[PDB]
């Protein structure tokens, strides 16, 4: 019919605009390799369609490390993750890229990260207490506010990509293989993030999104922690994914959302979105999650999970929510 309405990030809108071209132009980035003979695989940690991750050891100092062996994908796709990890290196709660080597066997680039004595999230989350959830969520806001202020969107926030060393209260945001630099006006691929954490802007096919996409994904994790239902929105596919959301936030705000951005809703939604009222977060409270739920917890979640990305809270604003007052404000 007509065209979608443009959009711009409310914050960090032109951070790359004013930075040295080399900073964001990863394509012309020239990788400097290290000595792969330096590391040895010790155990498989998991895989994916773009890589296989392992636990390794630096043979020269016995230091434990994690090696991500890539799979053919395009130099551009490779340089992008490398450029990003180096621009963020040192950032709060950002996994650290220790090295970059040429894997002889696979003949593809293998990245070496700092290793974190992680505790399976599927088990860790069942033991987390109210303070912990607030605490880790806060640590994730740091990395989120840092990468955002550095002009980068993660695009794949989820438990799986958050490493935690519980005894040491240490958290790191990993896997920036889908991370991209943010340029106002640009139209991105919506085929990013993982189903359960995909934002309505992705489910509705709106391309001019921004960092606010990570806030929704982050909202999805919060909900699954305080309610002890992981994942929270269990869609069967991308279309059903939106349906599940609709069934909680209600269909009215959803339609207010596409009307506003004059989005062309895929026909396949007509027959499945239905008509649902916005449910109250209390409907998800029970005798097993009550201790983890509070007004500040719901008010916060409420400000993270909204159709209009623009209305979502920015990581920086979120760090200011009463829900984090306690979080032993370092001070020292
Ligand atoms: O940054 C990256 O993408 C790789 C990357 C860089 C830092 N890591 C990293 C660092 N320390 C520990 C782990 N562990 N430890 C146990 C474990 C179990 C599973 C996984 N899954 C991996 C994360 C997604 C699937 C593979 C990691 C796991 N991973 C990973």
Curated annotation (Swiss-Prot):
Constitutively active protein kinase whose activity is not directly affected by phosphorylation. Seems to be regulated by level of expression and localization. This is Casein kinase II subunit alpha. One of its GO terms (cellular component) is cytosol. Heterotetramer composed of two catalytic subunits (alpha chain and/or alpha' chain) and two regulatory subunits (beta chains). The tetramer can exist as a combination of 2 alpha/2 beta, 2 alpha'/2 beta or 1 alpha/1 alpha'/2 beta subunits. Also part of a CK2-SPT16-SSRP1 complex composed of SSRP1, SUPT16H, CSNK2A1, CSNK2A2 and CSNK2B, which forms following UV irradiation. Interacts with RNPS1. Interacts with SNAI1. Interacts with PML (isoform PML-12). Interacts with CCAR2. Interacts with HIRIP3. Phosphorylation does not directly affect casein kinase 2 activity, but may contribute to its regulation by forming binding sites for interacting proteins and/or targeting it to different compartments. It comes from Homo sapiens. Belongs to the protein kinase superfamily. Ser/Thr protein kinase family. CK2 subfamily. Expressed in gastric carcinoma tissue and the expression gradually increases with the progression of the carcinoma (at protein level). The chain holds residues 1 to 332 of 391 of the full protein. The active site is at residue 156. ATP binds at residues 45-53, 68. The keyword Cell membrane does not apply. One of its GO terms (biological process) is rhythmic process. Residues 39-324 form the Protein kinase domain.
